[PDB]
Amino acid sequence: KVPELQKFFQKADGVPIHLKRGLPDQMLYRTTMALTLGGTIYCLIALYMASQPR
Amino acid sequence: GAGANTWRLLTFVLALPGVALCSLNCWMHAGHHERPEFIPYHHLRIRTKPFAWGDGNHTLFHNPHVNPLPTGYEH
Amino acid sequence: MAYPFQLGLQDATSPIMEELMNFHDHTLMIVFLISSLVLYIISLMLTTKLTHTSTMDAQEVETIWTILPAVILIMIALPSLRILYMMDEINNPVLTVKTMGHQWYWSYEYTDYEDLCFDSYMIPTNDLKPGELRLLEVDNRVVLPMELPIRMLISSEDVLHSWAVPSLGLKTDAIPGRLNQATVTSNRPGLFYGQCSEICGSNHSFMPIVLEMVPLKYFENWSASMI
Amino acid sequence: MFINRWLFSTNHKDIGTLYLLFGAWAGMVGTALSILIRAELGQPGALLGDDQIYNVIVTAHAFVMIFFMVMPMMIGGFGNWLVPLMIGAPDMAFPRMNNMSFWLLPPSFLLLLASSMVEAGAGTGWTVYPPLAGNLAHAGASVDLTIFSLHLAGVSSILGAINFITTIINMKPPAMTQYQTPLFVWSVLITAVLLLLSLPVLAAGITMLLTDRNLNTTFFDPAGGGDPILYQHLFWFFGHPEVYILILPGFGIISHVVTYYSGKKEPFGYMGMVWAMMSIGFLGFIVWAHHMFTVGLDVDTRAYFTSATMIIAIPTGVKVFSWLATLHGGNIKWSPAMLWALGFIFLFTVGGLTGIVLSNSSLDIVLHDTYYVVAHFHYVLSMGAVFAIMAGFVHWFPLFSGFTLDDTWAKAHFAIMFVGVNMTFFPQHFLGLSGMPRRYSDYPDAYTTWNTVSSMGSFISLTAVLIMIFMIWEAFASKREVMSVSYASTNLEWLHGCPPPYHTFEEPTYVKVK
Amino acid sequence: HYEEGPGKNLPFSVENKWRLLAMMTVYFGSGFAAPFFIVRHQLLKK
Amino acid sequence: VSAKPAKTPTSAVEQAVGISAIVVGFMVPAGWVLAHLESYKKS
Amino acid sequence: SGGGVPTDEEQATGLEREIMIAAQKGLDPYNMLPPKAASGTKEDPNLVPSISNKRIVGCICEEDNCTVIWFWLHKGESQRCPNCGTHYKLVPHQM
Amino acid sequence: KIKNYKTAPFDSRFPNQNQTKNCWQNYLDFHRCEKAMTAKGGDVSVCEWYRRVYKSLCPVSWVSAWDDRIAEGTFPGKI
Amino acid sequence: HQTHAYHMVNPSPWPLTGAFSALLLTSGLVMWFHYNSITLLTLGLLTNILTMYQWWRDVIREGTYQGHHTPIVQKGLRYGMILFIVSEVFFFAGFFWAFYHSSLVPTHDLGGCWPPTGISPLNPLEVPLLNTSVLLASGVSITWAHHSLMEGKRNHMNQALLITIMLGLYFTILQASEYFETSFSISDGIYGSTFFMATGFHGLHVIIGSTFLIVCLLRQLKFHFTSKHHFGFEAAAWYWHFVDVVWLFLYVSIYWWGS
């Protein structure tokens, strides 16, 4: 199963190799970037809330 | 050097029988000791900042059979 | 203690700070010499119209180039090691005083005999008597006999402090759980002013040390009076 | 389009550009902190009140100027821009790790800013000595956020160091040796070696400090069995390698600038430069306890350590005298970067000589934590490293941007920069000799006058960097181009034009041995 | 492909002097004004 | 390094506006927060 | 127990396949080894192949010399080293 | 005797800057002399000089803490 | 085109995503130790595992399916891992220096002897020698695995890597089960602090090595490794030899000497 994935990944589509599989790599890349953006903004919200006293 | 069957023979003579023999040796020496009587030491069982899991006094691997709290043991 | 427009060090009272001052003059003369070399060469060799921009012998001057800074560093380092070994003799002291650096104040124990201890806090700026010094005057001055070897054991209760008097040439770390030793002597009586040199919180500027050095009979009278 | 070019970038020039931008921003943050410090020390009295907020400003000034101005700009920016251009490589070996190192840097900056914002404050000095940095004096989250800032910056610089060593050792043409490379390549090789050899020591040290703070260990608690002298040992075992890291790519930059603008084909004594840089790198690892001459060590230990300072004084003397020796008979072109390099030579000589005065433990009894130390480290850092950053920036701003700076404004900027730093840091020698300790928010009256003079000098340096910003804008307000560069045959980075294209060295260099 | 040439290898446009002057002064002024507002924050706390 | 004549050359007045813009944009916020410290100390 | 593990003469693909196929005939089109056919005269110059109209050429024209000197070399006749004068000629046809 | 003890002397076995081990070992040596000649039953005050050594050398907070832990029975030193 | 034999990487998000993931770990530890929040920390841990999975999966795609891995590239990756290993040497050496400075001169609060009074140390001749022998046997089995890889044996390789992985799992669960039933805790002075920090960091590194061995196994069962271009398995052998010589230094330093 390696030489036929070798045929699959040697394509001149111009797509980067982390969107070359089509659907599922695009799906978990989108979910990864969405959850890390949400985590970053909730991290800044948490840091700003911790900066203020009670 | 750079053989393949001689390394299988080497591991099947030395490594796994040695680990099995040491496992039997640690099995015949698998015996617990009694609980030592408790002295409230000061450089042992410190509490400066409480732990951030569960209650705050228990450690992460605190087995109550052997590990003492600063205020004695648990019953 | 310091006066306005002071350039050099505070002058010496202990013998140790006299040898430190003489060595400082020696090494600063050496620094002036080699800075004069560097400055005069860089002023010289950018101020010509002659040029030489071809292949040059890479290794033909390196023996003098290597032995001159080595011999000047040896000439620096030999009196450095001499005065470095001049602070670890057999002391055979007369008095032993213990200092503990508490949280932004000092505490003093004269407990060789008839245990005596007190605390030193700064006299505040609004509560200064006329003529006194801002940020350098304490409640209880720390009284010692003069021209005698005095052991001074320095520690702290909680954090890192630095018991320092510059004019006597003393600066020793006050480390919790650790007892460092200094020796202090004098040649003149009077008041000597130092302050903390290690970062110790929000009033780190606000702990001074005042060493009042008096004769032996007046130190005995003061020790009998304070107990 | 923008996101793939800059946020997802995988070539060295873009990452070097982002280094230059981030380090300029962080440097101006540090400059604001320095103006705040000299504003507290200007007149007697408390402009800010307590010493806690002043210590917060001092620690913030130290971390922001060390790990976020000289470190990323110097090592990352100049290495990423020039090292694959000097050795003729198309890119770095691991460009994704280089991009990760950049993008870990502003998390570390945000964590440092949040450490400053939390009401406890990390007012400990840049030495994070316990038990002051424990959970008793600083019970709070400021010291922990500081520790994680140092963790993130350390991981960034280990990744960059690994990438730099593999792209220098491996990505050369197969005919060139290691002794045919330019001098800045050697400086960043040795810098990356000491970076990955020194950074895990402070990583372990602040990890144990964190577990002492929040996991109830007694690594540095004297009431449990430890001692803070162990922390001092690990911290300075990193710490003197760190300042040699701060100064070595500056040595490479000034060697390149002095070689170029004098007209020379090569620096005088290339083998002497290479030997002295590896000697400084090898010998900075065994000199750390000159930072603890008052902790109460053995007298034999401090004798060994001051001898170690002398034998580390000799090879940088070889370097500075050979920098003098490569000015011999050269067509001295009076460029602004030449003025930065000559100011580097003189002021770094003065700072090193004051360090040699400090190197004697006998006088380090007197001058420990006074302002004499502050004058020493500012005459090396704030003059040598800053002047080398400015020399590299002025020399390679045609390469990075494509436009040439106005040299008249650059000479004026050097003039007021020199006046400002020299008037800032020369009375600190007298304040250290008189006996003002470090970390003080208020001083006695006898230290007033020099402090007043010193405060004035800081504002002049502000004017310097203010007009520096105008210089950059003036280049982009002029859009004057470059037809040609002189001495383009010896220097490889000038051979593709100004600025070089995105894809360089697709057809690599042709060099043969036989 | 990405732009190659003078002034285009930068993450910001340089085609106008005045908006780029405003960009530089707000970027470096935010840098210069961050620690001052931090010091204002711990003074305003207590 | 040779330099081309400027494609969009600035004059003296625009450089004066530029230096005044840098000075005012750097001295309004820091100067404003330094102009009253005792107001933050609950005057 | 037999083979099973493939050798890299059929499994390896792409650029690794290209350099392995070309390198077994003594050819290095992808520049991993220092080049050959060295003579500085104008009748037998130092030949350099390319895929474009010019190439950066680095001369170490005497041994134990630190600074390589770099110069662009274009098509046409044999240009010279800009301090020693060894002749370099460009033949841009390789792949 | 060795009395008229003005202060602590220069101990050649511990001549460096750190002086924790001097007062620590002198306090345990005083207690060990007390235990040894209480077991012997003789004049236990002949090593009273050793007592005055820790009067002069390490601070009264340390001595008070050590007295408290030896009164409760939480002394890590083996006496 | 491209005539240099170096590898040009496509634009990549996992620098940015892993960097902000590390930011989430640092802020999660701060919000856990001081404000007791788990959610940001777990979000960061998920972001690391997703970022590292995507990154190393794509490095697998370039190295195996697209053939960008020249000998110059493998030499560069070898240099990079060797430098990472040397960095971890100096990390564990800092921990060793902490333990040696702690135990060389015992302080007065401990009583002046190592071990301190009130603790019962683990004597080395019981079941720690079993886990030293387990790591040694795993090193021998991975050396047989590497030699069967170079020779061209497949089923011998599968048996060897399987026994290597299960002895690594046996080692980490044996260390964990012993540290359930140890007689002293993290708050039991400098001995407990040094011991538990050193053994916990070694346990984290051996579970990292076990995970790297597992992904090496599932790569090998999909025929990724050829007869000579098998740098992932060479990496597994190098990191495994690293982790058990580190454990040999821990067993000599802490368990045997002074206990």
Ligand code: HEA
């Ligand atoms: C750029 C960074 C840099 C550099 C290069 C150095 C270089 C040196 N440093 Fe320094 N140092 C710091 C940054 C740096 N330092 C910092 C940031 C601190 C503060 C740490 C703290 O907070 O405590 C510090 C602290 C510091 C101390 C602590 C003082 C104290 O705590 O009381 C000491 C002790 O002597 C010291 C010594 C030296 C020495 C001996 C050198 C030498 O390498 C200098 C040699 C350089 C030269 C240029 C001289 C060569 C020139 C010649 C002409 C030849 C001379 C030959 C003869 C005289 C014969 N440094």
Ligand code: HEA
């Ligand atoms: C990189 C290191 C660095 C630099 C540049 C500086 C620069 C300056 N430092 Fe700093 N300083 C330290 C590192 C540095 N310092 C450290 C490490 C301490 C010890 C902290 C402690 O006690 O723990 C310290 C301590 C320190 C104190 C001690 C406070 C106290 O203890 O009471 C003081 C006050 O006088 C001070 C002042 C200054 C001043 C007035 C400058 C001026 O030079 C400011 C002017 C600098 C610049 C303007 C930077 C140049 C940048 C540019 C020109 C822009 C670059 C951008 C491009 C090229 C695009 N410094």
Ligand code: CUA
């Ligand atoms: Cu005590 Cu500063």
Ligand SMILES: [Cu+2]
């Ligand atoms: Cu140093």
Ligand SMILES: [Mg+2]
């Ligand atoms: Mg100190």
Ligand code: NA
């Ligand atoms: Na003030």
Ligand SMILES: [Zn+2]
């Ligand atoms: Zn030639």
